[PDB]
């Protein structure tokens, strides 16, 4: 006799994503040597941590000092869908996973002249209230103030503080408010700093994670 087998129904269907490997046919082929080719990357999120890309505020990456005093320079949604991200590598990447968790880094590089000085504040407004339009109200959230000097750049981490352990990259229609709060960045004062640009970029944080790959897009 030969070995009796049961060909189970509902098993064997093709599947665009199965973890097997097709049989081969053309063998004994030897690839040209590619030892030490520059710039290899192993996991996207590495480049995402290493290279911060720019945020957008109506066609521009920077924010402009309207005038001296307590002005709210910017305020936005904490979603990878956010309009301000859009041109951002992080968002372009996140668009292929349903969920995420993690810290996001904001970078503020002051571009002004040597005689231009300013002081800023950035805060993370968790949901539950409405994003305050002035520092003194925002002074109660996790925030950080800082002035200009020799060091052009200032980095700041946006904390993952949510009910669930993961959250969606995607944005639901039913959501009016950004499920994860906002981050508003103010100016406290300045002098001779009007007109001057404070270009901002964002990179992935250390514990930032992307999970559950999905292909929702046109074709």
């Amino acid at each position: 006799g030969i070995f009796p087998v049961a060909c189970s129904d509902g098993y064997g269907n093709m599947v665009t994503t199965d973890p097997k490997t097709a049989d081969p046919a053309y063998g004994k082929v030897y690839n040209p040597p590619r030892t030490a080719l520059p710039g290899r990357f192993t996991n996207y999120l590495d480049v995402a941590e290493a290279c911060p890309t720019f945020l957008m505020f109506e066609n521009v990456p920077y924010v402009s000092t309207r005038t001296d005093g307590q002005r709210l320079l910017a305020k936005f949604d904490v979603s990878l869908a956010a309009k301000h991200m859009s041109n951002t590598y992080l968002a372009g990447l996140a668009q292929y996973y349903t969920q995420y968790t993690g810290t996001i880094n904001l970078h503020f590089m002051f571009t002004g002249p040597t005689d231009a000085k300013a002081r800023y504040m950035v805060a993370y407004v968790p949901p539950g209230m409405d994003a305050p339009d002035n520092p003194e109200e925002a002074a109660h959230c996790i925030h950080a103030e800082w002035d200009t000097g020799l060091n052009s750049k200032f980095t700041f981490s946006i904390p993952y503080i949510s009910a669930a352990d993961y959250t969606y990259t995607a944005s639901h229609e039913a959501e009016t408010t950004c499920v994860q709060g906002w981050v508003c960045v103010y100016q406290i004062t300045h002098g001779k700093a009007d007109a001057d640009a404070l270009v901002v970029s964002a990179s992935a944080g250390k514990d930032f994670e992307l999970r559950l790959p999905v292909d929702a897009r046109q074709q």
Partner: protein, 187 residues
Amino acid sequence: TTTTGESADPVTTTVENYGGETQVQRRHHTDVAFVLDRFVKVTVSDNQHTLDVMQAHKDNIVGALLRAATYYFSDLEIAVTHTGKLTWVPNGAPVSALNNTTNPTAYHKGPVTRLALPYTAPHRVLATAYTGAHLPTSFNFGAVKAETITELLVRMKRAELYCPRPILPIQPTGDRHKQPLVAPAKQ
């Protein structure tokens, strides 16, 4: 065996009290992980359907028993009788994804097509109830879409249950609920 009833502390006497002799049991069959580990038909209405275990019939063993708990965790196995390509998408995916084939899409091989899918919600556990009714968007295992979905079944694997909820039978008309039970042909 008198007890202070108000206490709410469990009490379990035995036939030994009057002279009997308590025996052995093998409650394998009444084991959570086990009972729920079987397929159950779920009423599909379109040619696309979000996977949700609460959709099992509330009087069906699995659904009745699942609802006998308030919080639960489990992986899924599904059996779909469909036509054309069957595509699955993970919890929280834009619905528009169902049309894309680079997502877990299985070609036809009738009758049914069977798959094993990972728990994919973003909560530590899911719920049977909720007071914050109508259950939240996120309480799903993703969604499926195929040109034609004739029938759909689901199986809970690795089931964990927390906090028991009630589970009622039929209210009998008379003193007991009599009915026809499987018997041999009269002859």
